[PDB]
Amino acid sequence: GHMTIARDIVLQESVGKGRFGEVWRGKWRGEEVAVKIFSSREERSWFREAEIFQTVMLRHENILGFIAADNKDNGTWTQLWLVTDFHEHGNLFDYLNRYTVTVEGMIKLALSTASGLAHLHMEIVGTQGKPAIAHRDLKSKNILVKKNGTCCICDFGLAVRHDSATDTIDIAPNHRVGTKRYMAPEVLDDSINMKHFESFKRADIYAMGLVFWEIARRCSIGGIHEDYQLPYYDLVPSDPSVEEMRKVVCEQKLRPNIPNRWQSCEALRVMAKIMRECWYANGAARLTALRIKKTLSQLSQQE
Numbered sequence: 343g344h345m346t347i348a349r350d351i352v353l354q355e356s357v358g359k360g361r362f363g364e365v366w367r368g369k370w371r372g373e374e375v376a377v378k379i380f381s382s383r384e385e386r387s388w389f390r391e392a393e394i395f396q397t398v399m400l401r402h403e404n405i406l407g408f409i410a411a412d413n414k415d416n417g418t419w420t421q422l423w424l425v426t427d428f429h430e431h432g433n434l435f436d437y438l439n440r441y442t443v444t445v446e447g448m449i450k451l452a453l454s455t456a457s458g459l460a461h462l463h464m465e466i467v468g469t470q471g472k473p474a475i476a477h478r479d480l481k482s483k484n485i486l487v488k489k490n491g492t493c494c495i496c497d498f499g500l501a502v503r504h505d506s507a508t509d510t511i512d513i514a515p516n517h518r519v520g521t522k523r524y525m526a527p528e529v530l531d532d533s534i535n536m537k538h539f540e541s542f543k544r545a546d547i548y549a550m551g552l553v554f555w556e557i558a559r560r561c562s563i564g565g566i567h568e569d570y571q572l573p574y575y576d577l578v579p580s581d582p583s584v585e586e587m588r589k590v591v592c593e594q595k596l597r598p599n600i601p602n603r604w605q606s607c608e609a610l611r612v613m614a615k616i617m618r619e620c621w622y623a624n625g626a627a628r629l630t631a632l633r634i635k636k637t638l639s640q641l642s643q644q645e
């Protein structure tokens with residue numbers, strides 16, 4: 343018995359929930375693991391996320407480490423499990439709400455997020471390669487902060503994979519699946535072309551620029567920083583509808599405000615420029631995750 347299995351895992355603490363499935367801190371052969379638990383009626387969601395997590399060549403330091411998909415029968419009902427590495431800090435949302443970061447801290451968070459997304463989006467051609475994956479629900483609540491102060495992306499149930507040979511998407515995607523606040527303009531107004539996989543990669547970039555805005559607010563220089571806020575906190579209610587978002591992002595064409603103090607620091611200037619270049623209404627004009635990783639790597643080298 344070498345491989346990690348459900349019957350050997352002991353749940354210790356409930357830590358949160360996804361759209362479906364509750365996340366627990368568990369102990370497996372003396373080590374901490376995260377267990378995402380789904381009910382029998384949530385099999386499709388569980389299966390889909392296990393399917394994404396099992397994608398060939400997916401493992402990357404900035405992608406949540408998958409361990410196993412399993413079942414657990416308690417004698418009354420069956421639970422469907424997704425076991426992964428456990429990241430004590432939780433999500434970027436929790437971390438940024440609790441702490442401010444330095445210039446170095448900010449670049450580590452932004453660069454690691456961009457590196458994970460670049461790896462996700464990257465297609466390695468051939469049967470022994472890797473299909474391109476688009477997240478479709480990227481947000482600060484879906485990005486985990488590791489002990490070393492770097493990020494890893496989780497919550498892949500809404501993801502879509504591209505097959506280069508057939509030039510097709512592995513599923514028939516439903517429209518407007520993600521978090522309304524982070525939905526790209528083309529997703530909000532339904533102009534998105536669901537037949538082109540590049541559309542999904544471009545909508546993930548938009549959401550990442552919003553996440554960078556959340557990080558940059560918390561970068562403290564000389565003890566000066568902004569308070570924690572979700573993007574569009576100044577324009578929409580909590581739990582905004584698609585129409586509330588669409589009126590702001592598409593009709594009025596507003597983006598989160600870029601403060602005057604971000605022009606005073608080079609790291610903040612580079613971050614502010616990436617943001618504007620992720621926020622174009624035209625998806626084709628946005629930066630790629632690979633290009634962002636390259637720009638931030640250069641900035642990390644220099645600092």
Ligand SMILES: Nc1ncc(-c2ccc(CCO)cc2)nc1C(=O)Nc1cnccc1N1CCOCC1
Binds near residue numbers: 427
């Ligand atoms: N691997 C992990 N390791 C640790 C933790 C964790 C650690 C601490 C806390 C804060 C408690 O006060 C919460 C959660 N979560 C995950 C995880 O994959 N979570 C996860 C996966 N899919 C959807 C939503 C998720 N959550 C993101 C974090 O917030 C809850 C939702």
